[PDB]
Amino acid sequence: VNSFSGYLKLTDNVYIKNADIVEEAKKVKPTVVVNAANVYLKHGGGVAGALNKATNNAMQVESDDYIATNGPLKVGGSCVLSGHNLAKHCLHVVGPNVNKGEDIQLLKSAYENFNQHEVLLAPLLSAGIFGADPIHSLRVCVDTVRTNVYLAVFDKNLYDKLVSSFL
Ligand SMILES: Cc1c(O)cccc1C(=O)N[C@H]1CC[C@@H](NC(=O)c2ccn3ccnc3n2)CC1
């Protein structure tokens, strides 16, 4: 039993809700919140911009030190950093950005990072400003993630489309 509330169950392990991931994180304080990161951990907009804003820029400060030490992530890769005031940990995961020409096959590799964590609060990878089709992202999530994932979808219209079209 966990503290996530109001989710629709899609499969044995995947749950979905129309919710602002920032507000959901602040309420649940999950062990792991997933950020829709880029390789530079520059949290300017989208989910990353919103999460970072909620940390009063502490996420960005921590991220800049991480990059200065380690260099950029790989597309499809991830790193674990602090969750600040939102979660115990933040798993920064880089889905391919379609508006940069990156291979959509890398989306499965990106979701594989979730399997290293028993339970996660997450957005749909490569959705929103990353330019991929969120219906496809949900399909890859369901077919790749085996751990327990709670997906927060900000846009109500998109949420209804995702549920109504789910196979
Ligand atoms: C006032 C304030 C603070 O004090 C601290 C932090 C943020 C805000 C603030 O202005 N929040 C607003 C409202 C929520 C917005 N969410 C998104 O853009 C977003 C995009 C994609 N997503 C996928 C799942 N969830 C997602 N959410 C961002 C703008």
| Cα(47) to centroid(ligand 1), Å | 7
Domains in the chain: ranges and CATH: 8-163 (3.40.220.10)
Structural contact between residues 122 and 24, judged by C-beta atoms closer than 8 angstroms: no
Q: Which atom of ligand 1 is nearest to the CA of 153?
A: 24
Q: Token pair for residue 147?
A: 């751990």
Nearest CA to ligand 1 atom 9: 50
**Residue from 88, 161, 70, 138 nearest 79 by CA:** 70
**Number of neighbours of residue 74 by Cβ within 10 angstroms:** 11
Yes or no: say if 37 and 43 are a contact pair by the CB < 8 Å rule: yes
Query: 54: CA distance to ligand 1 center in Å?
Result: 8
Angle at 86 between CA 26 and CA 29, to 5 degrees: 60
Nearest CA to ligand 1 atom 6: 54
Q: What gap in Å lies between CA 137 and CA 160, rounded to an integer?
A: 15
Q: 134 and 122 in contact (C-beta within 8 Å)? A: no
β-bridge mates for residue 36, sequence order: 93
123: which 2 tokens? 């957005």
Query: What's the length of the chain?
Result: 167
Alpha carbon 132 to chain centroid distance?
14
Return the closest-CA partner of residue 140 out of 100, 99, 93, 81: 93
| Interval between CA 42 and ligand 1 midpoint (Å) | 16
Output the 3-class SS for the chain.
CCCCCCCEECCCCEEEEECCHHHHHHHHCCCEEEEECCCCCCCCCHHHHHHHHHCCCHHHHHHHHHHHHHCCCCCCCEEEEECCCCCCEEEEECCCCHHHCCCCCHHHHHHHHHHHCCEEEECCCCCHHHCCCHHHHHHHHHHHCCCEEEEEECCHHHHHHHHHCCC
In this structure, are residues 43 and 51 in contact, taking their beta carbons and an 8 Å threshold? yes
**CA 53 to centroid of ligand 1, rounded, Å:** 8
Those residues with Cβ within 8 angstroms of residue 8's Cβ, 6 or more apart along the chain or in another chain: 15, 16, 17, 163
The structure was resolved to a resolution in Å of: 1.0
Beta strand 14-18 with 89-93 is unpaired
